[PDB]
Design a protein around this ligand. Sequence first.
Ligand SMILES: Nc1ncnc2c1ncn2[C@@H]1O[C@H](COP(=O)(O)OP(=O)(O)O)[C@@H](O)[C@H]1O
Length: 341
Amino acid sequence: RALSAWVGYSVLGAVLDPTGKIVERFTPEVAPISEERVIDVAPPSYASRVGVREPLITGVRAIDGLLTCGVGQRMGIFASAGCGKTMLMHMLIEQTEADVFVIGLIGERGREVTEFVDMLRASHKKEKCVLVFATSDFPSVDRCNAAQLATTVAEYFRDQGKRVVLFIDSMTRYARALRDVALASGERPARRGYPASVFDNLPRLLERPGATSEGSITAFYTVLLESEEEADPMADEIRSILDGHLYLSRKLAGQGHYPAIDVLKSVSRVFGQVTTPTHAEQASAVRKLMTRLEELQLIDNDRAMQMRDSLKAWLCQPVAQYSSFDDTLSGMNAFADQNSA
Ligand SMILES: Nc1ncnc2c1ncn2[C@@H]1O[C@H](COP(=O)(O)OP(=O)(O)O)[C@@H](O)[C@H]1O
């Protein structure tokens, strides 16, 4: 399982199978610069990293205002079917300003992999993106190697001083792949099916992104919620290792409200660390306003109803639209002024 892969500028604008071989390109080769690297390497020493200080502007108002991410943070995207998470990923790719984008699709159906590649084909920052994939037809070993290879490419470009963003689709599937790889060997599984090595190996992958002296890997990890929430232990044991999490709602999805971000169910554990005190005050004000508006739900009724509509309209944002951080904060200020009255 512990394989070596060839990474570098040669795979910029390219699709990789779980072994590091280029199986497709959507732009010419940027430069023939490569490196052989072990894809299951240990995370950087806790004493060598720099703290999550700077924020990462993702262009989305619901994130920049109430859930601001940090350069080096490890965010989670919690979704079920039809919550709109893949268009959220493409939105983040388009709007965010970063040197390199690295997507890692794990256990996805090959149709969806092709669809995402074709989406990357039309992006105007396509030469920055590197896709790594492992379809269902691949063994669990290769689905695991896919996420490890994506993290390794991100690490390569981090050591080059570049600002790197890393997506991993379905951390659930990488967890299940580690579980299956361990179970295929002599490993004992009484903990909800997952043996001991799974819980040591998940954070080993999660603790690799993060800011360094120069160069950084901000990472997003997606988690499937099934359609129950009564039986979902892996989601909650994954949320604990993340520096925040994004909750996507089937409710606002069925409404047509995208990004289907439930702001109240979400948090960025680096928000206060990457936001100015003014922004931090306005965020708490808008949070109180939202909790008051949803707490009320069963001339004082009319104003508050038009206010709920105004706020939900401000939170809604098509992937075409882009909002700068200044305008985002200008909207935050208005919806805080409303809380002050
Ligand atoms: N600009 C848009 N206008 C209307 N609907 C949109 C737009 N962008 C995304 N959607 C909705 O997002 C949904 C796709 O969700 P999807 O990303 O496939 O969720 P998942 O990734 O969890 O499968 C579609 O049903 C579509 O209605």
